[PDB]
Amino acid sequence: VIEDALDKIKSNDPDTTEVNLNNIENITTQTLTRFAEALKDNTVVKTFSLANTHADDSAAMAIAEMLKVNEHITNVNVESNFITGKGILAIMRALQHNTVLTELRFHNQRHIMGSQVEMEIVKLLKENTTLLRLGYHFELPGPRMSMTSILTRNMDKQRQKRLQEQKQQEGYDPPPPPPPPLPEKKLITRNIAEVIKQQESAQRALQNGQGSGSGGSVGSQPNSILKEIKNSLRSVQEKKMEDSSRPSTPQRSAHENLMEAIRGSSIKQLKRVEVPEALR
Amino acid sequence: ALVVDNGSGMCKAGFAGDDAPRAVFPSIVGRPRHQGVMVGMGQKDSYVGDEAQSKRGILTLKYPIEHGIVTNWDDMEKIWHHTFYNELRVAPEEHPVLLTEAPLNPKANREKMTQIMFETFNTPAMYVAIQAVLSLYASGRTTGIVLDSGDGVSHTVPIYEGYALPHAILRLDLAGRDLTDYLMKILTERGYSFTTTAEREIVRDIKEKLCYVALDFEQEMATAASSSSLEKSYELPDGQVITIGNERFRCPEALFQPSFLGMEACGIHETTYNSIMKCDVDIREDLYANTVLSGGTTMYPGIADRMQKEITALAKSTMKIKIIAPPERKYSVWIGGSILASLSTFQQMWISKQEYDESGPSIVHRKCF
Ligand SMILES: Nc1ncnc2c1ncn2[C@@H]1O[C@H](COP(=O)(O)OP(=O)(O)NP(=O)(O)O)[C@@H](O)[C@H]1O
Numbered sequence: 108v109i110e111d112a113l114d115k116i117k118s119n120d121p122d123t124t125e126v127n128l129n130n131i132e133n134i135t136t137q138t139l140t141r142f143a144e145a146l147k148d149n150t151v152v153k154t155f156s157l158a159n160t161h162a163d164d165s166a167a168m169a170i171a172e173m174l175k176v177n178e179h180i181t182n183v184n185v186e187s188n189f190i191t192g193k194g195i196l197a198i199m200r201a202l203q204h205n206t207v208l209t210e211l212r213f214h215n216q217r218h219i220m221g222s223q224v225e226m227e228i229v230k231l232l233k234e235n236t237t238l239l240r241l242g243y244h245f246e247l248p249g250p251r252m253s254m255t256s257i258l259t260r261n262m263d264k265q266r267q268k269r270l271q272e273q274k275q276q277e278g279y280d281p282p283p284p285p286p287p288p289l290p291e292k293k294l295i296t297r298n299i300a301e302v303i304k305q306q307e308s309a310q311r312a313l314q315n316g317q318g319s320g321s322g323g324s325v326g327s328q329p330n331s332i333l334k335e336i337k338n339s340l341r342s343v344q345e346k347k348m349e350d351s352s353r354p355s356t357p358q359r360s361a362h363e364n365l366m367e368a369i370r371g372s373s374i375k376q377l378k379r380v381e382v383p384e385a386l387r
Numbered sequence: 388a389l390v391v392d393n394g395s396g397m398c399k400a401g402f403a404g405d406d407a408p409r410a411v412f413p414s415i416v417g418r419p420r421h422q423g424v425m426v427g428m429g430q431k432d433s434y435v436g437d438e439a440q441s442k443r444g445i446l447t448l449k450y451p452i453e454h455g456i457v458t459n460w461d462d463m464e465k466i467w468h469h470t471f472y473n474e475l476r477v478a479p480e481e482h483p484v485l486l487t488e489a490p491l492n493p494k495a496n497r498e499k500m501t502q503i504m505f506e507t508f509n510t511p512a513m514y515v516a517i518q519a520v521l522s523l524y525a526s527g528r529t530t531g532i533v534l535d536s537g538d539g540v541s542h543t544v545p546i547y548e549g550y551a552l553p554h555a556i557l558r559l560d561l562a563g564r565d566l567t568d569y570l571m572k573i574l575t576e577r578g579y580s581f582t583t584t585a586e587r588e589i590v591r592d593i594k595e596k597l598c599y600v601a602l603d604f605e606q607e608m609a610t611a612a613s614s615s616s617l618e619k620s621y622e623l624p625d626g627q628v629i630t631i632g633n634e635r636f637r638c639p640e641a642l643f644q645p646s647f648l649g650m651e652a653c654g655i656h657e658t659t660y661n662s663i664m665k666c667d668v669d670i671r672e673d674l675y676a677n678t679v680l681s682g683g684t685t686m687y688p689g690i691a692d693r694m695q696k697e698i699t700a701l702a703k704s705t706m707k708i709k710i711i712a713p714p715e716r717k718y719s720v721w722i723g724g725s726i727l728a729s730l731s732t733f734q735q736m737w738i739s740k741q742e743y744d745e746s747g748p749s750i751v752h753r754k755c756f
């Protein structure tokens with residue numbers, strides 16, 4: 108039963124990977140708070156899941172701190188419960204500096220999560236780099252967008268990483284389901300082949316290449332080149348280098364009083380004029 | 388090669404070069420209703436597809452895709468796993484995958500879709516095509532305007548030699564279930580009550596089996612107030628038959644007159660002409676003669692006929708308005724892709740795992756356009 112699992116949890120059973128407490132009847136805050144602490148120094152559980160078990164914000168606080176005090180769980184499933192954003196946020200801040208958890212789901216709660224609670228979740232997890240999948244439907248375009256880009260830039264760190272180690276000098280690299288579809292015979296309709304001959308024929312219009320554009324406006328080089336004019340004298344005629352006098356950049360009174368005076372100014376000191384006209 | 392066309396409601400996936408999808412199942416994920424749920428689930432946390440359709444009882448069904456845009460990425464990953472592993476019984480490592488997207492999708496989403504395929508499922512190669520564009524290719528064309536009316540939103544997408552015109556894409560917030568909603572509202576106003584999802588699917592059926600678009604509204608309105616040639620009976624499951632008349636066409640008149648739904652937006656007929664006008668004066672001619680119908684809500688009888696009549700009264704005198712409605716425009720978005728993925732010419736056009744592993748998901752706006 109429960110205790111058979113919990114036994115193993117603090118027994119550190121080298122063989123219990125999943126703790127599945129899904130749809131388990133009559134479970135307490137404390138009986139889950141035990142589990143939370145029962146896993147507080149565990150090392151053999153990668154998946155802790157309590158689906159559809161009247162969980163609450165204490166169970167969350169339980170799980171939340173358990174999170175910042177556990178380095179082997181990659182996945183937390185607190186689904187179909189009765190948890191508010193007061194609890195959801197508990198687990199959220201914990202993850203502010205928790206670099207192991209990789210998936211968390213809180214779908215299908217009691218009530219609407221709210222919105223301050225929703226924009227919280229995004230600015231909150233903003234300094235998290237480890238979370239890969241966040242099981243929740245945001246009901247707000249703003250947050251939901253902010254969020255998806257984050258789980259993208261967390262996961263690109265995986266792609267960047269594999270880029271450094273994986274290849275770079277590593278040697279090498281219960282009723283009915285009403286189902287009426289259609290059996291097949293393949294494809295007789297056609298004549299989109301020619302645009303593909305055309306789509307091979309064209310594309311990459313104008314200019315685009317390179318690896319990184321650290322320098323300025325990697326301009327397409329039609330402008331730069333076609334606007335010949337800027338090309339000051341090259342190869343032949345005058346040598347125009349302006350080495351001059353003997354001054355330098357330590358303290359200067361004339362220039363820095365000038366700066367002090369330039370800063371202390373405003374168009375409120377100038378004599379009013381005007382320029383509305385357009386002349387024929 | 389694989390083809391996957393995701394929808395705001397129904398999902399169709401299958402092998403490329405194929406006649407039709409092998410996998411067509413609802414794009415839904417079910418999780419327990421509430422309270423002392425248990426009895427129902429076993430050791431599961433959710434159900435997927437046509438088992439989530441059969442257990443609608445204690446399940447609060449949700450769609451990852453809303454108005455054709457992925458709003459739930461976790462359930463989006465759930466659906467995709469279900470597809471390769473459960474529904475299609477195939478390993479996504481052994482296959483390249485062509486996926487689909489809505490008109491005016493965010494770049495952000497294009498990228499997650501990209502990254503999910505490459506990191507999670509580990510696909511050799513992948514491409515992402517605008518669904519409207521995939522519907523034109525099935526019709527055997529590369530240029531034209533595609534009217535796409537699905538479940539949540541409507542789109543008119545001008546297309547020029549293989550590429551959709553973003554500046555000219557118009558979008559309308561009326562589609563499939565607004566008509567189901569509407570039919571429900573009037574069939575109720577007239578007697579029987581339709582408010583529950585179980586009874587809602589029969590309004591979908593009253594609709595699809597008995598609704599049509601009139602060519603001339605005010606006429607068919609009066610034909611019906613005059614005689615009863617327009618009446619048709621429908622048998623409910625309990626055995627009580629009901630009779631609709633002017634509701635057969637008052638339902639899809641919403642498409643042409645959104646005001647019937649209290650909308651200040653213009654009908655699907657103007658939403659198609661208006662688009663053509665923000666197109667180039669040198670392609671309007673081939674736009675008008677290549678308007679193509681796509682999606683399930685374009686399946687009403689006489690919708691092509693009404694369209695022509697409307698868009699000829701809007702257009703200038705000299706243009707021919709040809710309105711093409713393929714007989715299989717329910718699975719056309721898939722079919723148009725099934726053919727694309729098979730074309731020898733397309734193999735160089737994929738996205739390599741290498742290219743991704745070097746540049747990240749960002750390479751998809753340039754490689755796919
Ligand atoms: N013969 C028909 N006549 C009228 N309506 C139909 C017919 N067949 C299907 N439908 C409607 O088609 C709608 C959904 O089909 P479809 O447009 O293919 O959805 P989808 O592609 O999954 N969503 P999206 O990807 O956002 O377009 C429903 O509202 C159905 O009622």
Ligand SMILES: [Mg+2]
Pocket residue numbers: 394395518537682720
């Ligand atoms: Mg569609």
